[PDB]
Every structure is written in C-alpha cells, then in structure tokens.
C-alpha cells in the first residue's frame, strides 16, 4: 500500500518518492513538512499523492540560526516556513495600484489584505529575516514574506485566516515599544478607571470600526453589570487599527488609510482591500475597482496617527 509524492531539500529540485502508507514520513525521510505543517509524526494520506514535501534534517546549528534570524524557539519553524514557501513561490504577485498584491489562490484573500495593509503603515520588524522579507515584498518579490506570515501565524497553505489575527501575530514581531494608549472607563456605580496600554494593545481595538466613536466614547459592559463608557484619552502610535465583526459601514474618502471588507459567513467568506488614495480603490487580489463613495461589510479600518490628546474634562 503506497503513494507517489515529490520531496525537496532546496525548493528548486523535486524527486519522485514512493512512500509506504504504513510508516510515518519521519521514519522514511526524517523531518518532513507539507504546506506549512510538520508531517514528521504523520502517516501518509491518500490526498498527499502528487504533493511536494520539504525535507529538513535535524541540525543544532539550524535551530540556533532560527532564533537569531527568525526570533523563534519552535524547532519546526524552518521546515514549516520552507514547506509553505514551496507553495507561495507558485503564487503570482501583481502590482495593483502601486502596491504588491497576491493573485487569488488557495484561499489567500486574508494574506493579500494583510500584505497590502502592511505596505501602507509605518512598521519595522524585529526578526532580521522577517524585516529582509518585508523589504523584498514591498519591492515586488513577496513569496518569502508570505511564507513567513504563514509560519509566524502557525497556518497552512489553503487554510482560511483572519486579517486581524494575522496582524496581531505580526505586530508581536514589530517594534511597537514606543506605542502608547491611555484609556478612561466611566461607570455610574464604579467610577473612573484609567488604563495604560503599550505595544500591540496600544494600536489594536476590537468593538468598533470608528476611530471618532472611540475618541467620543463607546459603550462597553462593566464588571458590576451596568454599562460603562470607554474613551480614548491619549494615543502615541504611527497608526491605529479599529476592528469589529463584519457589518455595513460607510467609508468616506480621506477619513481613513485603508480597510478590510469581508463578505460571507464566519470562516467561509472572502476578503477585499479598500484603500483611500486620490479616490477609493478596491483591490480584490489581482482585480481593481475605482469608486468615489463606499458602503459594504467592513471588519478592519486603519487610520494615521502621530499624537492625540483628548479634550474631555
Ligand atoms: C475568515 C476567517 C478565518 C479564520 C477565523 N478564525 C478566527 C478565530 N481563530 C482562533 C481561528 C481562525 C475567522 C475568520 C473570520 O470569518 N473572521 C471574521 C469574522 C466574521 C464574522 C461573520 C461574518 N458573517 N457572519 C455571519 C459572521 N464574525 C466575526 C466575529 C468576530 C470576529 C471575527 C468575525 C471576518 C473577521
Ligand atoms: Zn461598574
């Protein structure tokens, strides 16, 4: 009982291997990886026929090099990255409206939306190999950056993803120490409670798409049971990301940087990227659509920032 698959050690040369289905990939090839997953302790599936597997034997110098260059301690990182890279190298990366995008394939709508957003926000990555991949992605060659996004998010090629979760994971690898957010929460029976958030917690919010509604005050539930009002007191970050579950929202030109439109059910839909240039543009992978006004199911909105201070007494 066998299947025929392809193995690779360099992502350039493929070798047809006949694999025995009664043994795991590990006992036949050593550390084996497929589309961003570790298949070492897994027995071959019928679906694996014709697929390309990355083989990466265990070397202690590789593990140490991964900590220094990728900033990871997961011994499967390199193999998951290399195996995902085999697939992301097969994708097309068109320049849509001056930005590097990804032509739709293997449910990568979320990857394209994240990639297009990353080109419009001031960000510097701490892992040296991630920052190098980021520079190359901005210049057009984005296959390595995409494989690293899948690797840092623990995702596989073909598996749908959330743009907000992807951003959350990537921001943990960005230098956001100088980012600061001061919030005040007011409950009629609890009082006022000021909170100071730093790093990723200072640039992301879940509950509303409007940065103006956040500045004015938003209704959140309090630990007492009553409703409280949370509002933005101070903000010191180069950008802000306001997210909420997909809902019909009106995007007015020049009021935001870029946004993520999500159409369809939870974990079933498709992403489109809306960006505010001289007019509103909608980048749907390799497709582009102009428009003066916009209303659709938005789930993420990014705004520009330097320093904000509330005028609320
Ligand atoms: C595409 C995808 C892949 C993967 C994961 N997960 C997220 C949870 N991780 C732990 C595993 C991966 C989610 C989505 C996803 O659908 N995320 C979004 C989303 C959609 C709706 C939604 C849309 N229509 N309807 C009826 C509901 N509700 C939401 C509520 C809260 C938050 C997000 C919601 C569009 C942001
Ligand atoms: Zn309270």
Numbering used by the authors: 3 to 315
Question: What does the publication say?
Answer:
A crystal structure of SARS-CoV-2 PLpro in complex with 4 was determined to 2.59 Å. This structure reveals that 4 engages a region on PLpro that overlaps with the substrate binding site but does not extend to the catalytic triad active site. Compound 4, like GRL0617, binds in the pocket formed by the flexible BL2 loop and forms critical hydrogen bonds with Asp164, Glu167, Tyr264, and the backbone nitrogen of Gln269, as well as π stacking interactions with Pro247, Pro248, and Tyr268. The C terminus of ISG15 (His149-Gly155) overlaps with the binding site of 4. Last, rigidification of the scaffold via introduction of a geminal-cyclopropyl group in lieu of the pendant methyl substituent resulted in the lead compound (PF-07957472, 4) with an additional threefold improvement in biochemical and cellular antiviral potencies and also a reduction in the apparent intrinsic clearance (CLint,app) in a metabolic stability assay using human hepatocytes.
Conserved across coronaviruses, PLpro, along with Mpro, is responsible for polyprotein processing, which is required for the generation of a functional viral replicase. As such, PLpro is hypothesized to be an essential viral enzyme, and PLpro-targeting antivirals may offer a differentiated mechanism of action compared to antivirals in the current therapeutic landscape.
